[PDB]
Design a binder for these strands. Sequence first.
RNA 1: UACCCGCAGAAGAAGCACCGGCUAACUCCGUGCCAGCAGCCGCGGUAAUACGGAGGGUGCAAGCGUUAAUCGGAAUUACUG
Lengths: 205, 324, 32
Amino acid sequence: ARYLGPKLKLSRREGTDLFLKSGVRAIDTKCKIEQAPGQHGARKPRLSDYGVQLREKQKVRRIYGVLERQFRNYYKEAARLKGNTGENLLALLEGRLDNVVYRMGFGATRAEARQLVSHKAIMVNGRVVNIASYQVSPNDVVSIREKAKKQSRVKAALELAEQREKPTWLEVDAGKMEGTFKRKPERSDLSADINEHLIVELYSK
Amino acid sequence: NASRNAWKASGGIFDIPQKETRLKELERRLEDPSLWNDPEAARKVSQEAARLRRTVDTFRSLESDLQGLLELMEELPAEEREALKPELEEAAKKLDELYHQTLLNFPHAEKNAILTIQPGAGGTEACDWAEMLLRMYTRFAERQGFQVEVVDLTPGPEAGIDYAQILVKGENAYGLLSPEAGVHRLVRPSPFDASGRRHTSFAGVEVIPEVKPEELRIDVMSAVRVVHLPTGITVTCQTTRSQIKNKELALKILKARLYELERKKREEELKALRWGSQIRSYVLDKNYVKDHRTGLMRHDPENVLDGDLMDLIWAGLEWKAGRR
Amino acid sequence: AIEALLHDPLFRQRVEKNKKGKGSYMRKGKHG
RNA sequence: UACCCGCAGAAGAAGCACCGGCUAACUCCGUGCCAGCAGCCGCGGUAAUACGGAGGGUGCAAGCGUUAAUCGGAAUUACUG
Ligand SMILES: [Mg+2]
Ligand SMILES: [Mg+2]
Ligand SMILES: [Mg+2]
Ligand SMILES: [Mg+2]
Ligand SMILES: [Mg+2]
Ligand SMILES: [Mg+2]
Ligand SMILES: [Mg+2]
Ligand SMILES: [Mg+2]
Ligand SMILES: [Mg+2]
Ligand SMILES: [Mg+2]
Ligand SMILES: [Mg+2]
């Protein structure tokens, strides 16, 4: 129910930086980011129509750290909902609690955020929420609980975030360690490198 | 060479846990006079004693010539120890004798045999294959100081030989050829097909040991045959020109056949109450000869065919012995 | 037993297809 | 009982299928039309990315494969068509 193994390998496979490591040290130093993993790494076969879509799907899943069934469910939900589908899916993904935490900057990585969520450190409207997959709604304040405020990891994460680009759809305070989820994110506010249409197509297939 | 010798000697050691324990058991229960009172028991002990006796005399060489070799053989072979290295030649001979003994001694193994060679599918090619097979066996006989008596030979029309039945007599003939019996496969580019694509033909080799008044008929065609009708298998002879001799020859072959029919059937029945493919292959393209059974491959086909490989036979014999 | 066994199919004559031969033409190769 | 609070210590907790094409994923060794594979096309006859083993990889994941059984693809009973 989680991906436990090598993180950078996944990134290599994808062809991108998936942000699977904290971002203290640049990914190019830690691994051969260009070369895909394995004995036949340098070789680059031309990828089929089916393949590309699949790859894209994997990338997205990898980014947020989500397994297939759950992803499928999310997709279905998105489809059910009104308006654009890919966008909806993206929003849903964002909405997850761990992801939100990561964005805020209490996790260095999304994995870290997830762990924090699990380990009963994250209060959502002053009630401890333990589930990573928990959707965070608009105007939901979300904080480190007072026992988990002393942890040196959290402050490090925050610092890291401060170097990183800040999201517009949240508002977060470093001293109080509580952030407010202001509105569900627009597509433009997320990264353009992901192609949600491909994912939609894949699921239609 | 030394390594080989060692390997050979290791086999001999292989029969040390058999000989001692068995011997002990025999003296403990069989040697006794109150056990002896039953004949069967006595017979059993005698059989058991036979095993012991074999192990006694021949193991000495293995032990005595091994232990005495190393002190004098180590550094010098050419000067002063030219006797001492070819002193181990004697040991080798002894080892060989032991091995051969182990291989043989089994039922009917001394009495000469009459192998029939039967071709397979392919038609024209196949007959040639049969002929080739026959030739190899003839050469083997020649090699091993035997005398071959050619009984049945029958030419195939387009080429080669259809049927043959060749009887050799001498020193432990059957033993050697008893393994061969079965299908021999000829995997080679036909000389008859213009395409020269690789083909596969076959040959059965029936090999049997040599060992009523109104239910047999004898018919002349100077030729002769002895048709034992109740079983229903015929034999036909054409070796000598004199008729009586030919008839006699036919009679022995037929008798052998009768025995063969009996014994195998009996064995089957007993088994009931209680190889798949080709045995050998010969792959001339590839210059390559796998015996599928016993996992040995000879890389000079020509040598094998010209004169049948004693070494291969020995291996086969060993396997057969093990199975027995 | 020897005789019938020979007659049975497992011991049928085998012939091989050709790669540069006459009946060579492979419509699709082993590998893409 | 749910739920909460405390205790210790990375501790007790990852497999299954697949990697010729369709179909995401490739190399070496063994075998030598055998042994085996296989949904279809078809692999294997001595350099097998198609068998078996390895290493590497891919996909699913407390499951993963196989079979059975239905609809779908099949506009291949076509009312739509
Ligand atoms: Mg689950
Ligand atoms: Mg939708
Ligand atoms: Mg592919
Ligand atoms: Mg398989
Ligand atoms: Mg080889
Ligand atoms: Mg190979
Ligand atoms: Mg080949
Ligand atoms: Mg394999
Ligand atoms: Mg089925
Ligand atoms: Mg229909
Ligand atoms: Mg159907």
